[PDB]
């Protein structure tokens, strides 16, 4: 903490020909570690960072596949196949952090002008709080499922081949709850629309009031449709019950 | 990120000194600042990494006609801090007029402490409304922070004067300072004299020394709210991202603050959440419902119980909210501090926006109006006359808090395209 929460905000300034070579991705890392004083550990040494996308951002993709590297006699239980899936869900969490970053930016740009308020002020901010809550419960859903309920496994399951199988099972559930499998594809389809809508909402700062209202109506249509879709995949996911509860109280 | 405590008011300076001795007991530090042999974790949120691993607390002491600095001087907490940060009335208007003439050097003190820190993100205030010296000077300091720093945060941990109708000048001062807190502060954590005093009479057997135990309660509340910032978790450890989820309604930024141990001298998270949503465990005083709820649980916690607790809490309809969006109850986890001298390390906190506080605000909206009609309790002080000749600033504060009441009642509705 205050490593990732400082890395992401400084990275989204870049995503343009920047973050290409490993001299500019390595220097934001030094800013991220000093902001927490929990890095500069021997665990923090020997890491590998890669890219798979160049910023042209609009597009909703994000680069920086981070990996944790381990040496050769322990590279039989922590393998070279798990780190690809760990980086795949790490990039997804970075994409997830992008929405709350953009809505925090629009919120804070609204804070400094609170001259005097008006009606355009309030009709602008209620869209922002709508999307702010949506990113907070999909973030808390990630915080509850991937970080907490299956991480209770592989800690009392610790009892030679069984260690590999338990690690693979924990990884398989980590990619299962991370919306990268095919059982969670209709949930994954709406998230691209949410990404594009909140980045367009960052871009709209007022240029046209009706444009932001149209973006609000499309966002509400996609969330209302997602409310019906996630119920169908519990009839099919005990983990998705956490999100289906977080989004529906006053939502129809 | 890093925040600097600006203590003002008599009870504000009391909770500031209590907060620093609480953090001295909490962290593995000496009363000089030197690192101990039982203390890596972060100690950079309130402490500068000074000379010999001296974790010197960054603080601003402001008052008028000094009283508590003598108790600071004959203590080992004049050897923990004060390399030069200590600066030396009874009404809002007298405090406003006194802060007007010495605004330059107190702004120089704010600039000096901002240059002292390494990452300025917000100015946290440990303040007491109608504490004596705090009234007026605190509101003028809020105006100075709003004018000079629109890009940084203003956090106010404050108690508000309620005696259940004692002092006849405090409703004017509290309503004016409340209008200044709406327009010139970014987030307010509200506390009350009757709520803390009633819970103190419940959990203990006191009634007269309310101040010394209110210091302990507010220090524990402030340490619990900054536990995830001081000790590293990995959720929203900057102040901006933490308060970003906490405020659902951009004018309604007054947050409920509960605490599941009233006295800290087993339990599941379901039971303390059922406890924590009850207003009897909250130290804050028709259709009332929340807008968004968040709670932070720190202790010997099993995370799958945080799952099942969140499931049962939202489904059994004890999270009561009718919003104009999807805004909901939120779970959050924290790591309990290593080397607390306190036992029973399971503790819970809630930070939620509730419309019921509007009713308490309505009492103040009654009181000033009542004391405007009797006209023997505005007292006709001359500093109030030179503050404003028409006395329409109090009517402006009443208008602002009336808009606040209508915004609470509109946030109860599923529409916020119309407030009154």
UniProtKB/Swiss-Prot annotation, chain A:
It is found in: Cytoplasm, Cytoskeleton, Microtubule organizing center, Centrosome. It is linked to Microcephaly and chorioretinopathy, autosomal recessive, 1: A syndrome characterized by microcephaly, cognitive impairment, underdeveloped retina and choroid, and epilepsy in some patients. The more anterior parts of the retina, near the periphery and pars plana, have a grayish hue and diminutive vasculature similar to retinopathy of prematurity. Visual impairment becomes evident during the first year of life. Component of the gamma-tubulin ring complex (gTuRC) which mediates microtubule nucleation. The gTuRC regulates the minus-end nucleation of alpha-beta tubulin heterodimers that grow into microtubule protafilaments, a critical step in centrosome duplication and spindle formation. Component of the gamma-tubulin ring complex (gTuRC) consisting of TUBGCP2, TUBGCP3, TUBGCP4, TUBGCP5 and TUBGCP6 and gamma-tubulin TUBG1 or TUBG2. TUBGCP2, TUBGCP3, TUBGCP4, TUBGCP5 and TUBGCP6 assemble in a 5:5:2:1:1 stoichiometry; each is associated with a gamma-tubulin, thereby arranging 14 gamma-tubulins in a helical manner. Gamma-tubulin at the first position is blocked by TUBGCP3 at the last position, allowing 13 protafilaments to grow into a microtubule. Belongs to the TUBGCP family. This is Gamma-tubulin complex component 6. It comes from Homo sapiens (Human). The chain holds residues 1529 to 1815 of 1819 of the full protein.
Curated annotation (Swiss-Prot), chain B:
Phosphorylation at Ser-119 by BRSK1 regulates centrosome duplication, possibly by mediating relocation of gamma-tubulin and its associated proteins from the cytoplasm to the centrosome. The keyword NADP does not apply. The keyword GTP-binding applies. Keywords: Cytoplasm, Cytoskeleton, Disease variant, GTP-binding, Lissencephaly, Microtubule, Nucleotide-binding, Phosphoprotein. GTP binds at residues 130-136. One of its GO terms (cellular component) is neuron projection. CDD domains: gamma_tubulin (cd02188). It is linked to Cortical dysplasia, complex, with other brain malformations 4: A disorder of aberrant neuronal migration and disturbed axonal guidance. Clinical features include early-onset seizures, microcephaly, spastic tetraplegia, and various malformations of cortical development, such as agyria, posterior or frontal pachygyria, thick cortex, and subcortical band heterotopia and thin corpus callosum in some patients. Component of the gamma-tubulin ring complex (gTuRC) consisting of TUBGCP2, TUBGCP3, TUBGCP4, TUBGCP5 and TUBGCP6 and gamma-tubulin TUBG1 or TUBG2. TUBGCP2, TUBGCP3, TUBGCP4, TUBGCP5 and TUBGCP6 assemble in a 5:5:2:1:1 stoichiometry; each is associated with a gamma-tubulin, thereby arranging 14 gamma-tubulins in a helical manner. Gamma-tubulin at the first position is blocked by TUBGCP3 at the last position, allowing 13 protafilaments to grow into a microtubule. This is Tubulin gamma-1 chain. It comes from Homo sapiens. The lineage of its organism: Eukaryota, Metazoa, Chordata, Craniata, Vertebrata.
């Amino acid at each position: 903490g205050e490593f990732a929460q400082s890395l992401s905000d400084l990275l989204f300034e870049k995503l343009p020909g920047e973050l290409l070579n490993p001299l500019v991705l390595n220097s934001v890392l030094s800013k991220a570690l000093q902001c927490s004083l929990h890095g500069d550990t021997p665990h923090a040494s020997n890491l590998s960072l890669a890219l798979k996308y160049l910023p042209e951002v609009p597009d909703v993709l994000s680069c920086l596949e981070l990996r944790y590297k381990v040496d050769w006699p322990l590279n039989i239980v922590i393998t070279e196949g798990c780190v690809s899936k760990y980086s795949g869900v790490f990039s997804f969490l970075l994409q997830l952090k992008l929405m709350m970053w953009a809505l925090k930016d629009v919120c804070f740009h609204l804070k400094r002008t609170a001259m005097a308020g008006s009606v355009q002020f309030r009709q602008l901010q209620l869209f922002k709080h709508e999307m702010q809550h949506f990113v907070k419960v999909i973030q808390g859903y990630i915080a509850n499922q991937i970080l907490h309920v299956t991480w209770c496994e592989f800690r009392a399951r610790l009892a030679l081949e069984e260690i590999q199988r338990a690690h693979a099972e924990y990884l398989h559930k980590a990619v299962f709850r991370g919306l990268l499998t095919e059982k969670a594809a209709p949930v994954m389809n709406v998230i691209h629309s949410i990404f594009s809508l909140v980045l367009k909402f960052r871009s709209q700062l007022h240029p046209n009031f009706a444009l932001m209202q149209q973006s609000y109506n499309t966002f509400k249509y996609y969330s209302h449709f997602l409310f019906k879709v996630v119920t169908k995949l519990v009839n099919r996911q005990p983990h998705l019950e956490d999100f289906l509860l977080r989004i529906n109280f006053n939502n129809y | 990120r890093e925040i600097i405590t600006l203590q003002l008011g008599q009870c504000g300076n009391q909770i500031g000194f209590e907060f620093w001795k609480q953090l001295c007991a909490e962290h593995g530090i000496s009363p000089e600042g030197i690192v101990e042999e039982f203390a890596t974790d972060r100690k950079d949120v309130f402490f500068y990494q000074a000379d010999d691993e001296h974790y010197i607390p960054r603080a601003v002491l402001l008052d008028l006609e000094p009283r508590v600095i003598h108790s600071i001087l004959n203590s080992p907490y004049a050897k923990l801090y004060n390399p030069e940060n200590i600066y030396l009335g009874n009404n809002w208007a007298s405090g406003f007029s006194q802060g007007e003439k010495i605004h330059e050097d107190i702004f120089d003190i704010i600039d000096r402490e901002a240059d002292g820190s390494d990452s300025l993100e917000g100015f946290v205030l440990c303040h007491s409304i109608a504490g004596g010296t705090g009234s007026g000077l605190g509101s003028y300091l809020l105006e100075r922070l709003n004018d000079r720093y629109p890009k940084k945060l203003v956090q106010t941990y404050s108690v508000f004067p309620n005696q259940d109708e004692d002092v006849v000048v405090q409703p004017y001062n509290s309503l004016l300072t409340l209008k200044r807190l709406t327009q010139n502060a970014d987030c307010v954590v509200v506390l009350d004299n009757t709520a803390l005093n009633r819970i103190a009479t419940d959990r203990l057997h006191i009634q007269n020394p309310s101040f010394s135990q209110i210091n302990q309660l507010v220090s524990t509340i402030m340490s619990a709210s900054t536990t995830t910032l001081r000790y590293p978790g990995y959720m929203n450890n900057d102040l901006i991202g933490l308060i970003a989820s906490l405020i659902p309604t951009p004018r309604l930024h007054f947050l409920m603050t509960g605490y599941t141990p009233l006295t800290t001298d087993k339990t599941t998270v379901l039971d303390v959440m059922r406890r924590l949503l009850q207003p009897k465990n909250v130290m804050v005083s028709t259709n009332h419902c929340y807008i968004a709820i968040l709670n932070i649980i720190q202790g010997e916690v099993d995370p799958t119980q945080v799952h099942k607790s969140l499931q049962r809490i939202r489904e059994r309809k004890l999270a009561n909210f009718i919003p104009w969006g999807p805004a909901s109850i939120q779970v959050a986890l924290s790591r309990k501090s290593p080397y607390l001298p306190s036992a029973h390390r399971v503790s819970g906190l809630m930070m939620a926006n509730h419309t019921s506080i509007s009713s308490l605000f309505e009492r103040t909206c009654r009181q000033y109006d009542k004391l405007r009609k009797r006209e023997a309790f505005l007292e006709q002080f001359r500093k109030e006359d030179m503050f404003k000749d028409n006395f329409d600033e109090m009517d402006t504060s009443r208008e602002i808090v009336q808009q606040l009441i209508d915004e609470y009642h509109a946030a109860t509705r599923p529409d916020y395209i119309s407030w009154g």
